[PDB]
Short mmCIF file of C-alpha atoms and ligand atoms in Angstrom, two decimals:
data_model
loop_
_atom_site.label_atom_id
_atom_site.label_comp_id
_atom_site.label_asym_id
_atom_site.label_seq_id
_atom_site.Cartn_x
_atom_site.Cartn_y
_atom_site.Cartn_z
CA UNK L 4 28.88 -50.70 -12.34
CA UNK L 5 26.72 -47.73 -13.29
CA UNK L 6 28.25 -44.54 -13.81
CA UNK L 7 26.98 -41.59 -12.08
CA UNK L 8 24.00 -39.41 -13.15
CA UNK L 9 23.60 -35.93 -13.61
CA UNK L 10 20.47 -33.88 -13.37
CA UNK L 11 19.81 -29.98 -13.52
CA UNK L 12 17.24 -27.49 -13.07
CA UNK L 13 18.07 -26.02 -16.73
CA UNK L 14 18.36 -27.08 -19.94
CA UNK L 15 21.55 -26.89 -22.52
CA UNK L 16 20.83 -24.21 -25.03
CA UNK L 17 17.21 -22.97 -23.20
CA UNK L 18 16.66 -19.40 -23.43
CA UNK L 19 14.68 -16.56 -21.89
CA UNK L 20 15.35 -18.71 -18.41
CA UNK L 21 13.77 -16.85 -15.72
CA UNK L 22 15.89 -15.79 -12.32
CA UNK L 23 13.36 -15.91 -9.94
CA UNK L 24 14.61 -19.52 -8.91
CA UNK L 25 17.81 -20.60 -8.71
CA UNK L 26 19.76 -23.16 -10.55
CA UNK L 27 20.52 -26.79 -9.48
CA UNK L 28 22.46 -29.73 -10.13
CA UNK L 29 21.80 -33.41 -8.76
CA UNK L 30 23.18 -36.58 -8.33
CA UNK L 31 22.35 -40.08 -8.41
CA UNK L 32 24.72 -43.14 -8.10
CA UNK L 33 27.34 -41.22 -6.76
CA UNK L 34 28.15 -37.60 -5.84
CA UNK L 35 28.68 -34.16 -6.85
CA UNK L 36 32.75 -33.64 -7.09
CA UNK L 37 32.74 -30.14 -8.56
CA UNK L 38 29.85 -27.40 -9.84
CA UNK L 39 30.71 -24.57 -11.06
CA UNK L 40 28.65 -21.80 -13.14
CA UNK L 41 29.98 -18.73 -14.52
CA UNK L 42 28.31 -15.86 -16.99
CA UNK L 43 29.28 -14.57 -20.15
CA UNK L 44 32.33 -12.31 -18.36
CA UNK L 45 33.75 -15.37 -17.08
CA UNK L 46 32.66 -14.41 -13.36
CA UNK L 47 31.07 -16.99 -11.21
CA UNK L 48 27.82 -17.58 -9.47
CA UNK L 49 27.57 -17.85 -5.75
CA UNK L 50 26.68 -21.76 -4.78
CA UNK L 51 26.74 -24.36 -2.38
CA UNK L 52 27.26 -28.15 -2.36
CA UNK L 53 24.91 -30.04 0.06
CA UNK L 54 26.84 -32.02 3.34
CA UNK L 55 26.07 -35.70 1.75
CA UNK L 56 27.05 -34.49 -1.98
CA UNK L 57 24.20 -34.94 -3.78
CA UNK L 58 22.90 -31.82 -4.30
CA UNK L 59 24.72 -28.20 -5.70
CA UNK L 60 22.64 -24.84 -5.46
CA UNK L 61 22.98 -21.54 -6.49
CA UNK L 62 23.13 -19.18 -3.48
CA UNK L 63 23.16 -15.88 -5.28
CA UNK L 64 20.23 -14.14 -7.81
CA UNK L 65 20.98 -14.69 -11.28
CA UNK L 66 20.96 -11.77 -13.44
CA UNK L 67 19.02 -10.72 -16.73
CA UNK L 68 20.29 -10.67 -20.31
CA UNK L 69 23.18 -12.84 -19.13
CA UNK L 70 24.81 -15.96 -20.33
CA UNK L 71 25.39 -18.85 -17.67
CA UNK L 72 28.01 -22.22 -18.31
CA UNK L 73 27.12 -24.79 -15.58
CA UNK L 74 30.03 -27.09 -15.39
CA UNK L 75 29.41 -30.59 -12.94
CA UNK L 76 31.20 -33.40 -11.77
CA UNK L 77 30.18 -36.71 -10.47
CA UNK L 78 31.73 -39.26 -8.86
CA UNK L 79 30.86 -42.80 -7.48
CA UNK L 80 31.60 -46.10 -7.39
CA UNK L 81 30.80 -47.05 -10.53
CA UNK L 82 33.02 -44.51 -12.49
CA UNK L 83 33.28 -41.00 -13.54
CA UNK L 84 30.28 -38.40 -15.51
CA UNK L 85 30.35 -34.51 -16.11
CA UNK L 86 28.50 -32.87 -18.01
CA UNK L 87 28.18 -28.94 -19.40
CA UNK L 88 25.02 -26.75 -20.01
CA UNK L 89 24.89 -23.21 -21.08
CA UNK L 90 21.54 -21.00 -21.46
CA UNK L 91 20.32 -17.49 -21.22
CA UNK L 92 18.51 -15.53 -19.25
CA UNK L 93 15.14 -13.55 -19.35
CA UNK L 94 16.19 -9.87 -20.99
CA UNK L 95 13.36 -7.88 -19.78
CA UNK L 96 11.94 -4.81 -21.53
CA UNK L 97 11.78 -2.78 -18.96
CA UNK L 98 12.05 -3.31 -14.95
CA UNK L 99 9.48 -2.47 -11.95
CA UNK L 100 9.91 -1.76 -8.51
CA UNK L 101 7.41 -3.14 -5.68
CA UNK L 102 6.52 -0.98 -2.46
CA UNK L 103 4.61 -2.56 0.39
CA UNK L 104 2.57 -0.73 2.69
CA UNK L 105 2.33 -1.35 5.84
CA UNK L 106 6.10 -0.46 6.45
CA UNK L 107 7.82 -3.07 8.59
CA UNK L 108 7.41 -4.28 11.97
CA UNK L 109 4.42 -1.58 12.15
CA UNK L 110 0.90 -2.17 14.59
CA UNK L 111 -1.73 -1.09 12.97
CA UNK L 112 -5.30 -1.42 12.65
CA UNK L 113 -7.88 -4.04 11.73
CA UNK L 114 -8.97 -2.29 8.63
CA UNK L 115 -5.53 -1.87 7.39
CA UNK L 116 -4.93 -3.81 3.56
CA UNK L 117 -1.96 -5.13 2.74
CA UNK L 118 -1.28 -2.79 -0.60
CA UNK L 119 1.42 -3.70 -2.78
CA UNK L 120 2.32 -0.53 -5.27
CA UNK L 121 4.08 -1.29 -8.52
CA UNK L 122 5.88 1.82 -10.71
CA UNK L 123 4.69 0.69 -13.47
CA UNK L 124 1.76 -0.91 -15.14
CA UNK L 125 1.25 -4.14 -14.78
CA UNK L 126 -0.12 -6.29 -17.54
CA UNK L 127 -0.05 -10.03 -16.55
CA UNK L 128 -1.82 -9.21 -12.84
CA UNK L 129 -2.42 -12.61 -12.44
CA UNK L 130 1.25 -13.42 -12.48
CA UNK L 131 1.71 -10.59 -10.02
CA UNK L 132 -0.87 -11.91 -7.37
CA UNK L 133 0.84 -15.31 -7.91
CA UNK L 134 4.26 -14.00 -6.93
CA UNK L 135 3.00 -12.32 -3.57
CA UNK L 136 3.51 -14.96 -0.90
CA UNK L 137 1.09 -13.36 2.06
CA UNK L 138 0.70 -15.61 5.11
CA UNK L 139 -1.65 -14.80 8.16
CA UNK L 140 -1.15 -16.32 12.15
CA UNK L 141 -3.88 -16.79 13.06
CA UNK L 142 -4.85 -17.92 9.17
CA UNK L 143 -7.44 -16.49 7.50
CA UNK L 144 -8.76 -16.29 4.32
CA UNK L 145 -8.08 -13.12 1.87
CA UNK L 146 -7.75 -12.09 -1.63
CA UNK L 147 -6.25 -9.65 -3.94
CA UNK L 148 -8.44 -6.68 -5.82
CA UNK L 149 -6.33 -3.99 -7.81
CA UNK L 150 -7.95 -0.54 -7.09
CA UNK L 151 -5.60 0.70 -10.74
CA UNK L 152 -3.19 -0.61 -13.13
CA UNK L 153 -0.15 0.01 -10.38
CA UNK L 154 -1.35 -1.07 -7.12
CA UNK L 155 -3.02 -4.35 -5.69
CA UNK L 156 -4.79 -4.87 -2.36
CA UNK L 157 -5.17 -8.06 0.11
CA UNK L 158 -7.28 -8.34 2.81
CA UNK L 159 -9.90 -10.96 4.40
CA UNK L 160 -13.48 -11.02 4.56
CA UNK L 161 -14.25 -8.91 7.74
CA UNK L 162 -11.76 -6.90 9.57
CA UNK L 163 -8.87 -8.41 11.26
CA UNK L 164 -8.56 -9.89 14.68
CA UNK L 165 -5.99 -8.10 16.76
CA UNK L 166 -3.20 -10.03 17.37
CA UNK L 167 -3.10 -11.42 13.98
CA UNK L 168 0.30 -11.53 12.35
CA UNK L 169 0.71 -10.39 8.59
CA UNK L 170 4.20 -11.55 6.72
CA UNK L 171 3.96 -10.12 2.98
CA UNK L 172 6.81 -11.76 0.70
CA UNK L 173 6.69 -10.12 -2.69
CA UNK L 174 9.02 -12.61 -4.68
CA UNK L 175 9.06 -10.41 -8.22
CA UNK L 176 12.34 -10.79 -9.02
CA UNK L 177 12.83 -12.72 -12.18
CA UNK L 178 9.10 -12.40 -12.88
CA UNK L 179 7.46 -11.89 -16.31
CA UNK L 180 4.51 -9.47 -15.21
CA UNK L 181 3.87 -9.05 -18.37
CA UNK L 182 4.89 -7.06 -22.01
CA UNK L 183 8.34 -7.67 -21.07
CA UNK L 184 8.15 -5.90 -17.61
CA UNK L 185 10.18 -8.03 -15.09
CA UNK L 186 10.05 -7.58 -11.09
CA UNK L 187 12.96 -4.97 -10.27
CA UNK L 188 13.47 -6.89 -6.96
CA UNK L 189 11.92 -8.63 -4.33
CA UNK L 190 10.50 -6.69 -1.06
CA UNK L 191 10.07 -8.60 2.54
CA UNK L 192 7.24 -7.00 4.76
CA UNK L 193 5.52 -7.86 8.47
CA UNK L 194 3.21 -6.34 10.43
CA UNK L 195 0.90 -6.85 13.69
CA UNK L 196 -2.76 -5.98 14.16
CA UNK L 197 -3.32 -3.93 17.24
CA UNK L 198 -6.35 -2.66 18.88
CA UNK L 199 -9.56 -2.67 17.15
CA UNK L 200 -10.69 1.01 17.04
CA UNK L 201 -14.04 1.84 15.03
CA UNK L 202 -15.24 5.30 14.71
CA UNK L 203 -18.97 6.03 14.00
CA UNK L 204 -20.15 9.18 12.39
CA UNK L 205 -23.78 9.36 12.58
CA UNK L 206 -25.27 12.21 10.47
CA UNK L 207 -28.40 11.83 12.26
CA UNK L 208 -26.87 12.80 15.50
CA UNK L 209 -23.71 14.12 14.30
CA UNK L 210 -21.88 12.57 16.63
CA UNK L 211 -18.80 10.48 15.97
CA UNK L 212 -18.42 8.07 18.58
CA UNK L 213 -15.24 6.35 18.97
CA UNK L 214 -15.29 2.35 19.98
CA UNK L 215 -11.99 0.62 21.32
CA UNK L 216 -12.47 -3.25 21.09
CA UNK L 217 -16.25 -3.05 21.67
CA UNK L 218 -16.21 0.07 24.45
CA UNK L 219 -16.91 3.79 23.65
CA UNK L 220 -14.40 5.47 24.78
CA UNK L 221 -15.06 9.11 23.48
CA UNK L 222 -17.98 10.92 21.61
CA UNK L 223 -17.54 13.90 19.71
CA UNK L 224 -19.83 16.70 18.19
CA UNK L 225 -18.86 16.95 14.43
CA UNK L 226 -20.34 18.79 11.22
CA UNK L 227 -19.86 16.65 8.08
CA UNK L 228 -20.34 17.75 4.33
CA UNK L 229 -22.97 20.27 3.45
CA UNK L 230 -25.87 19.27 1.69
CA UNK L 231 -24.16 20.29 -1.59
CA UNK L 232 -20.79 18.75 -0.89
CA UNK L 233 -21.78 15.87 1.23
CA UNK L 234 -19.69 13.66 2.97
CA UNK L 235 -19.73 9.98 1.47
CA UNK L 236 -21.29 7.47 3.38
CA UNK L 237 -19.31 3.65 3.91
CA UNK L 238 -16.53 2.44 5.75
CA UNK L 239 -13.08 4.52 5.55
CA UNK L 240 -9.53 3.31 6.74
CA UNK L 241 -7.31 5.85 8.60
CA UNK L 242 -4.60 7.15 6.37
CA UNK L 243 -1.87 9.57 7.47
CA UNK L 244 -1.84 11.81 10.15
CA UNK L 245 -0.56 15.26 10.65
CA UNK L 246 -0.16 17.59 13.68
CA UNK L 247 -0.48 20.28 11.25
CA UNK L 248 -0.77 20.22 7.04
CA UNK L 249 -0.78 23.38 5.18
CA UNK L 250 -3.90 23.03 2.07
CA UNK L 251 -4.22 25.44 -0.71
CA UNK L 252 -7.08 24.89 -2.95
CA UNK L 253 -5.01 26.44 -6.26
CA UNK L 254 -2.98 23.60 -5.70
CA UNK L 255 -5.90 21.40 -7.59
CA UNK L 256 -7.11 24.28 -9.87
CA UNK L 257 -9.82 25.65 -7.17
CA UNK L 258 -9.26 29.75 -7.10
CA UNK L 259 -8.43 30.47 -3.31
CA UNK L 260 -10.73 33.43 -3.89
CA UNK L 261 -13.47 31.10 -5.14
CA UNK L 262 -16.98 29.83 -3.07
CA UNK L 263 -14.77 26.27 -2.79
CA UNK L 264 -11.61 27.85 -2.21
CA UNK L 265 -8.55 27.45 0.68
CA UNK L 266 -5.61 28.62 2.10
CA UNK L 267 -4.51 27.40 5.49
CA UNK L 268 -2.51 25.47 7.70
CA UNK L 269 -4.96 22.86 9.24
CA UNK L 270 -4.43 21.32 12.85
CA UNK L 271 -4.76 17.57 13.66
CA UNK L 272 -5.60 16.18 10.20
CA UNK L 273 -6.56 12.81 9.90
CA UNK L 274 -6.81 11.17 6.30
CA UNK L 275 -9.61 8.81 5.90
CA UNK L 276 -9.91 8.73 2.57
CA UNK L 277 -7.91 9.47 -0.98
CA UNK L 278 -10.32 11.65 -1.72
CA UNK L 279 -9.69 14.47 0.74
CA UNK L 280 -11.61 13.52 3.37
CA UNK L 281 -10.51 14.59 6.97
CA UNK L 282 -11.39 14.54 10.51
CA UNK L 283 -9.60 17.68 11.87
CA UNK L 284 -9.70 20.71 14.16
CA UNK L 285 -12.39 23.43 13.06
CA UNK L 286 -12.58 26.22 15.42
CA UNK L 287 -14.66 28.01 12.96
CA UNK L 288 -17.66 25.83 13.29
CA UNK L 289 -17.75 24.50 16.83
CA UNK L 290 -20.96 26.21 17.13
CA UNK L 291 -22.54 24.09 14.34
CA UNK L 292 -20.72 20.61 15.39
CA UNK L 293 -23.18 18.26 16.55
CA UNK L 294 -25.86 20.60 14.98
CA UNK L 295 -25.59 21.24 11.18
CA UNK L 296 -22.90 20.16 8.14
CA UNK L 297 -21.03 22.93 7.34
CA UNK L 298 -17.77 21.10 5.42
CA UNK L 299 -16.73 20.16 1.81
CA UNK L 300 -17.00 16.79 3.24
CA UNK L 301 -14.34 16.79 6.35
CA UNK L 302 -15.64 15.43 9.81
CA UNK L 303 -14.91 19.01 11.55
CA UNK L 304 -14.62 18.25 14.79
CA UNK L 305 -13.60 20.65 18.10
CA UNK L 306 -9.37 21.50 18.29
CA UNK L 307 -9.13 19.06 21.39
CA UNK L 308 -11.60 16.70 19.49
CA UNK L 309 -9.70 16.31 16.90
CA UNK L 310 -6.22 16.11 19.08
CA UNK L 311 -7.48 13.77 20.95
CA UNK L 312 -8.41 11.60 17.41
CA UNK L 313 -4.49 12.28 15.86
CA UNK L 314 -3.60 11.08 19.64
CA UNK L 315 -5.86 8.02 19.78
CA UNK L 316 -6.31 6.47 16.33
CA UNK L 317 -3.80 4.98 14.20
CA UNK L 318 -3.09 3.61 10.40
CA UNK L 319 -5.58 1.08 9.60
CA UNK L 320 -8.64 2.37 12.66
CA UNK L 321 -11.81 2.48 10.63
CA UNK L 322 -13.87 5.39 10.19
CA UNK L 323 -18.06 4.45 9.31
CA UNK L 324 -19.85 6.95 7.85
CA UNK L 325 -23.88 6.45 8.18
CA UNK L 326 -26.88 8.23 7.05
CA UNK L 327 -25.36 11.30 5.32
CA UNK L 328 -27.53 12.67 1.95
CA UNK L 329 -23.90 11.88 0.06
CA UNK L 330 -23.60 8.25 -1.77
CA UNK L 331 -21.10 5.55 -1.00
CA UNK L 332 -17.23 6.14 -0.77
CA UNK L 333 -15.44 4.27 -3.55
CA UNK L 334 -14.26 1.04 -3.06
CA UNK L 335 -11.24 2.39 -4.80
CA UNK L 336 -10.64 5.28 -3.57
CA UNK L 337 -7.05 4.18 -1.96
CA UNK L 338 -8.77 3.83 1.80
CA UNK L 339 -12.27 2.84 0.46
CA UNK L 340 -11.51 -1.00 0.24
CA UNK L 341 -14.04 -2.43 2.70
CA UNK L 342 -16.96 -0.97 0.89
CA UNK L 343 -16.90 -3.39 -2.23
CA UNK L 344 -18.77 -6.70 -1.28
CA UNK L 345 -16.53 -10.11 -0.81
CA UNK L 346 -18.02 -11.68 -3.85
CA UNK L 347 -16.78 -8.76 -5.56
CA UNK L 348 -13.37 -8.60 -4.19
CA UNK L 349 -12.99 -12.12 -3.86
CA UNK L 350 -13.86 -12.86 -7.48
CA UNK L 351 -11.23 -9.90 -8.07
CA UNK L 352 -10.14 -8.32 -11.59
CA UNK L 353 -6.94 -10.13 -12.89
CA UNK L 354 -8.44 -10.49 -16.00
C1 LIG S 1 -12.03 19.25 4.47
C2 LIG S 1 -13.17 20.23 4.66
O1 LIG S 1 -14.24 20.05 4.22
N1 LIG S 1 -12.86 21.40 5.44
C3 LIG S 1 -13.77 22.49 5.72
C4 LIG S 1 -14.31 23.18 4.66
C5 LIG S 1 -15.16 24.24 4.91
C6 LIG S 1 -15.41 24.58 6.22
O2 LIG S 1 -16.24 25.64 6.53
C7 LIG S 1 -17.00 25.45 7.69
C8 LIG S 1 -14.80 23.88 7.21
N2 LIG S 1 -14.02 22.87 6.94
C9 LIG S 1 -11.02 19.46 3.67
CL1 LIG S 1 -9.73 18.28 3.53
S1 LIG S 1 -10.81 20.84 2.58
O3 LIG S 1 -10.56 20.32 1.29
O4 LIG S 1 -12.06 21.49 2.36
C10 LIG S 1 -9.46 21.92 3.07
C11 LIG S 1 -9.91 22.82 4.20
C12 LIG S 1 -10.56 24.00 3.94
C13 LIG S 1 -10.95 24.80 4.98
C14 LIG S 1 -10.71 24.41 6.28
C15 LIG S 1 -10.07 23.22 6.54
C16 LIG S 1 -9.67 22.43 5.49
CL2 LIG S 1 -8.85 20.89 5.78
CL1 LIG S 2 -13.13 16.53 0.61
CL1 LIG S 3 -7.07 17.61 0.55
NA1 LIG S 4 24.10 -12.71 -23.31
#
């Protein structure tokens, strides 16, 4: 003749109980009658009772600086329990919103991180990278490295394989990131790796000769930084792209009147890097393409070049740079990721 028994995910009387899980009630010797929770306005939370009784789940978020009164009801053969429990929620300091990059359902290419963008600083990064689920068909192996205090990156070893699936579940919601600053929400990404496209600029020829999955498909005459403003060396990722993009140099406190200065609307743009690095149309110097570097550091390239570049590449191609007199592109420059070693990224800097 034992009487039911009564167990719950929460504790009578617990406090700062975090919502990024919900809230269950089982039984044992006998079944689940009635659950019920409610917050401090008396309203109730969504759940649902399992088909054989013996478990009750909440089916809705929780919310913060609330009050919850979990009410349950067990039956069996052996008699009768219930039992009440009533606890509080985490009451966050301030909130932060995740965005994911990729966007959703996108194809891009095999240099393309997964970034995950935070709006505002986070302090426990290690709970952050714990709470960003990312999952890889086929699997590899990958690791988060945060290029500031806002932003994280993921990405494997070597470039991806095309064909590779990328699902990116950021579950912050109810998370303590740290100094009271709680996950806003929780954001659901997926995207597909597509061709892999690798671009080689070669200041020694000053050529930049375009590979699609192992084939050059296209070579192109470019001029690169001049010797005073020389175009980084290292791998870049392929940013944004633009038919057109109007560039003033005041914008950034150059003088358009100044040596350095600009005022134009630019054709066929192609971000490779934070920076300002471009490849894009430069009817100016087609002469010197292929000859001599004549940029602040853009790959000018010819106006159906660089059209045919905007046409063929997308977000995530890689751009090489090799053998310029510039230094190495930051490995966090915002597109710069591949050019810090594994150890490096892998060992990462949570801490
Ligand atoms: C790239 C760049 O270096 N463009 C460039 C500078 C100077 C010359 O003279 C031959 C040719 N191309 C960029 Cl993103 S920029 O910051 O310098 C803006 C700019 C300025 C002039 C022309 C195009 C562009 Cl995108
Ligand atoms: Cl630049
Ligand atoms: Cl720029
Ligand atoms: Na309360």
């Amino acid at each position: 003749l034992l009487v039911p028994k009564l167990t719950a995910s929460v504790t009578d009387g617990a406090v700062g109980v975090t919502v990024d899980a919900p809230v269950s009630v089982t039984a044992a010797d006998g079944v689940l009658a009635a659950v019920t929770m409610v917050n401090d306005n008396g309203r109730p939370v969504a759940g649902r009772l399992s088909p054989d009784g013996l478990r009750w789940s909440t089916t809705e978020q929780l919310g913060y600086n609330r009050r919850y009164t979990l009410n349950a009801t067990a039956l069996g053969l052996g008699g009768a329990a219930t039992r009440q429990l009533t606890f509080q929620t985490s009451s966050p300091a301030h909130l932060t919103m995740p965005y994911v990059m990729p966007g959703d359902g996108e194809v891009v290419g095999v240099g393309e991180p997964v970034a995950i963008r935070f709006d505002e600083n986070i302090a426990d990064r290690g709970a952050a990278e714990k709470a960003i689920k990312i999952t890889t068909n086929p699997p590899v192996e990958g690791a988060f490295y945060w290029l500031n205090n806002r932003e994280v990156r993921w990405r494997p070893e070597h470039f991806w394989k095309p064909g590779t699936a990328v699902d990116v579940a950021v579950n912050t919601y109810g998370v303590d990131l740290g100094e009271g600053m709680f996950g806003e929400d929780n954001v659901q990404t997926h995207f597909t790796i597509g061709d892999e496209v690798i671009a080689t600029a070669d200041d020694n020829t000053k050529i930049l000769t375009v590979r699609v999955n192992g084939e050059v498909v296209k070579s192109m005459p470019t001029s690169m930084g001049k010797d005073s403003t020389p175009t980084a060396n290292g791998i870049y990722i392929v940013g944004s792209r633009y038919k057109h993009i109007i560039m003033d140099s005041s914008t950034y406190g150059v003088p358009v009147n100044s040596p350095n200065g600009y005022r134009t609307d630019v054709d066929w743009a192609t971000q490779i890097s934070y920076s300002g690095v471009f490849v894009h149309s430069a009817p100016w110097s087609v002469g010197a393409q292929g000859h001599t570097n004549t940029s602040h550091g853009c790959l000018n390239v010819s106006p159906s070049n660089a059209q045919w570049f905007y046409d063929h590449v997308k977000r995530g191609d890689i751009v090489e740079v090799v053998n310029t007199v510039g230094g190495t592109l930051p490995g966090i420059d915002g597109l710069g990721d591949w050019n810090i070693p594994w150890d490096q990224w892998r060992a990462g800097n949570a801490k």
